[PDB]
C-alpha cells in the first residue's frame, strides 16, 4: 500500500508518522525518547520566548514588575535550575498569561502550554521524555519522509510530503501508484490572524478534484480537534468563516468546517471523501481511526 500524507506545515503529518511507528512498529523505547530531550527543552525555551517578545509588540505589561528582570535574564540564559526558575515565574505571571491567551495574534508552538505547565517534571536533572512528550515535540520536516509497516496482511509505504520545491519528474514518481491520500488540516488554525484555513481548503481542492486520483481513496484528517474544542469556547468560527450563522459549540463548528471542505468535491456522486476528526497526539485515537482507514482500503 502506497500512502501519501499531505497537508500544510504544522497540520500534524510527522506526528502521525510517529504514531504509526508507535502503533505498528515497536513504539519509542526509553532510549529513543532520551534523544528528544534537547528538542523538548528547545521547544519549551522558544515558546516562552515567543510569548515575552509578543508582550512587547502587543504592549502588555507584566502582572508583577519583578518579572521584568526575569524576562531580561531569560534572554541572557538562553536546562539549568537557573533557567527553569526564570521560566516558571514568567509562565505564572498574569501578564504573561494575558499574552499567552492572545496567541492567535503571533506565532506560538501548539505544545507551548503542554510543556510550560509540566516544567517541574521537564526540568528535573534525570528527566526522561515520555512518549507523549516526544509526540508533542515540534521539528520542521524538510524533504519527503517514509515509513514502512505491516498491518492486517498489508505492507504500507507511507510518504510524508512537506512543502518543498522539486522537479516535475520526482513529483511524478511520488504521485504514481498511490493507493490512498490522507490530507491533514489543523482545525485550530481557524482563527489565526488569506485565511490559514482557506489556504488549506485550496490545497485540499486540488487533491480532491484531480482526475488522477479518481481511483485513489481521499481521506480527510480534521486534526487538532482537542485544541480546536478549547479555542471554540472563546474564539468564534466567524473569524474564519464570516458568513457562518450557527452556534459556537464544538459539534456545530466542527460539522461546518467538515462541510466546507467536503463541498469542494465537484464529483459528490462519483467520488467519496472519508472524513475523520483526529487528535494526532492521541495514539489511541489515531489507532482507532487508522484501523478504520485500513478497513476502507481492504473494502
Amino acid at each position: 500500500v502506497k500512502l501519501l500524507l499531505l497537508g500544510a506545515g504544522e497540520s500534524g503529518k510527522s506526528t502521525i508518522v510517529k504514531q504509526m511507528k508507535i502503533i505498528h512498529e515497536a513504539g519509542y523505547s526509553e532510549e529513543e525518547c532520551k534523544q528528544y530531550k534537547a528538542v523538548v527543552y528547545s521547544n519549551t525555551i522558544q515558546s516562552i520566548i515567543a510569548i515575552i517578545r509578543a508582550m512587547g509588540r502587543l504592549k502588555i505589561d507584566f502582572g508583577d514588575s519583578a518579572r521584568a528582570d526575569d524576562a531580561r535574564q531569560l534572554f541572557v540564559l538562553a536546562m539549568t535550575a537557573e533557567l527553569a526558575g526564570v521560566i516558571k515565574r514568567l509562565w505564572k505571571d498574569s501578564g504573561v498569561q494575558a499574552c499567552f491567551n492572545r496567541s492567535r495574534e503571533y506565532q506560538l508552538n501548539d505544545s507551548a502550554a503542554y510543556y510550560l505547565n509540566d516544567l517541574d517534571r521537564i526540568a528535573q536533572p534525570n528527566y526522561i521524555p515520555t512518549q507523549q512528550d516526544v509526540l508533542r515535540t515540534r521539528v520542521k520536516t524538510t524533504g519527503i519522509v517514509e515509513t514502512h509497516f505491516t498491518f492486517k496482511d498489508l505492507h504500507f509505504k507511507m510518504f510524508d510530503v512537506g512543502g518543498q520545491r522539486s522537479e516535475r519528474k520526482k513529483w511524478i514518481h511520488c504521485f504514481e501508484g498511490v493507493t490512498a491520500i490522507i490530507f491533514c488540516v489543523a482545525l485550530s488554525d481557524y482563527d489565526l490572524v488569506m485565511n490559514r484555513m482557506h489556504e488549506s481548503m485550496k490545497l485540499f481542492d486540488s487533491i480532491c478534484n484531480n482526475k488522477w486520483f479518481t481511483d485513489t481513496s481521499i481521506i480527510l484528517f480534521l486534526n487538532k480537534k482537542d485544541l480546536f474544542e478549547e479555542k471554540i469556547k472563546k474564539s468564534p468560527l466567524t473569524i474564519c468563516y464570516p458568513e457562518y450563522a450557527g452556534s459556537n459549540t464544538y459539534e456545530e463548528a466542527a460539522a461546518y468546517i467538515q462541510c466546507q471542505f467536503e463541498d469542494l468535491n465537484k464529483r459528490k456522486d462519483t467520488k467519496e471523501i472519508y472524513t475523520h476528526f483526529t487528535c494526532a497526539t492521541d495514539t489511541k485515537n489515531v489507532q482507532f481511526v487508522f484501523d478504520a482507514v485500513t478497513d476502507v482500503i481492504i473494502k
Binding site: 512543502g163 520545491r165 522537479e167 513529483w171 486540488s206
Partner: peptide
C-alpha cells in the same frame, strides 16, 4: 525548474 506539489497539480 523546481516546484511545490500544489503548483505541480495546478498545472494545465
Amino acid at each position: 525548474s523546481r516546484v511545490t506539489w500544489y503548483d505541480f497539480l495546478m498545472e494545465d
